[PDB]
Every structure is written in structure tokens, then in C-alpha cells.
Ligand binder design. Structure first.
Ligand SMILES: O=c1ccc2ccc(O)cc2o1
Length: 126
């Protein structure tokens, strides 16, 4: 159902959380090779997480679940902000700008957190 599809999206979000936390540690340690690999893995997880969210949103629209659609519209707007900042962080790493990278790392943590109270609401709505 849409709810098992939501359990998969939740699991991918958690896989990104885990990889992001190992990537931040590697950045702090100066292990640039490792960071470059984690960033590739995160970019993929964004691609897969987005695909699941798109499929959840479309099923809610077709099902007429107005409250789920509202909440999913809001969350995917937050998620998109995350994507834009993630691209900025990748571009900072490419450029060798650790100052900007550190900042973007902090910003992305706030986007994830600011969307969590919505993520919990959607499930109760689906
Ligand atoms: O799919 C995601 C969700 C959150 C997230 C947060 C940080 C990141 O680097 C990648 C991420 O991918």
C-alpha cells in the first residue's frame, strides 16, 4: 500500500542520515577521498528518496487524500531546499572551499530537522 511505500521512503531517509553522519566525520578528519565517495552515495540516495516521495504524492492525489497531499506538498518543498543546498555543498567540495562546506553541512542539518515534524504527520495522514 501507500504505507509500505512510506516505510521504504522512511528507511532511505534514515540511510541518508547515517551516511551523512559518516561523511561529516570524514570531512572533520580531512579524509577527502572518503568524503568524495560518501557524497556520491548521498546523491544517489537523494535520487531514490525523491522517486519514492513522488510516487507517494501521486498515489495520494489519485486517492483524493487532500490532507496527505497538502502535507506532502509542504514536505517536498522543504526537500527541494535540501537538494539546492546539497548541490551547493558538492560544488564547495569540488572547489576546495572548506569554509562554505562546513556552513552548508550545518544548513542541511536544519533542513532535515525542519522537515521531520512534517514527516511524522504524513504517516498519520496516509
Ligand atoms: O534523501 C535524502 C534525505 C535527506 C538527506 C540529508 C543529507 C544528505 O546529504 C542527503 C540526504 O538525502
Amino acid at each position: 500500500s501507500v504505507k509500505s511505500e512510506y516505510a521504504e521512503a522512511a528507511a532511505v531517509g534514515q540511510e541518508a542520515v547515517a551516511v551523512f553522519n559518516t561523511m561529516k566525520a570524514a570531512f572533520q578528519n580531512g579524509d577527502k577521498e572518503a568524503v568524495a565517495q560518501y557524497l556520491a552515495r548521498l546523491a544517489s540516495l537523494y535520487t531514490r528518496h525523491e522517486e519514492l516521495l513522488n510516487r507517494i504524492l501521486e498515489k495520494a492525489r489519485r486517492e483524493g487524500n487532500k490532507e496527505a497531499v497538502t502535507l506532502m506538498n509542504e514536505f517536498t518543498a522543504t526537500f527541494q531546499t535540501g537538494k539546492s543546498i546539497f548541490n551547493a555543498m558538492v560544488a564547495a567540495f569540488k572547489n576546495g572551499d572548506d569554509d562554505s562546506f562546513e556552513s552548508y553541512l550545518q544548513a542541511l542539518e536544519k533542513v532535515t530537522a525542519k522537515g521531520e515534524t512534517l514527516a511524522d504527520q504524513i504517516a498519520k495522514a496516509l
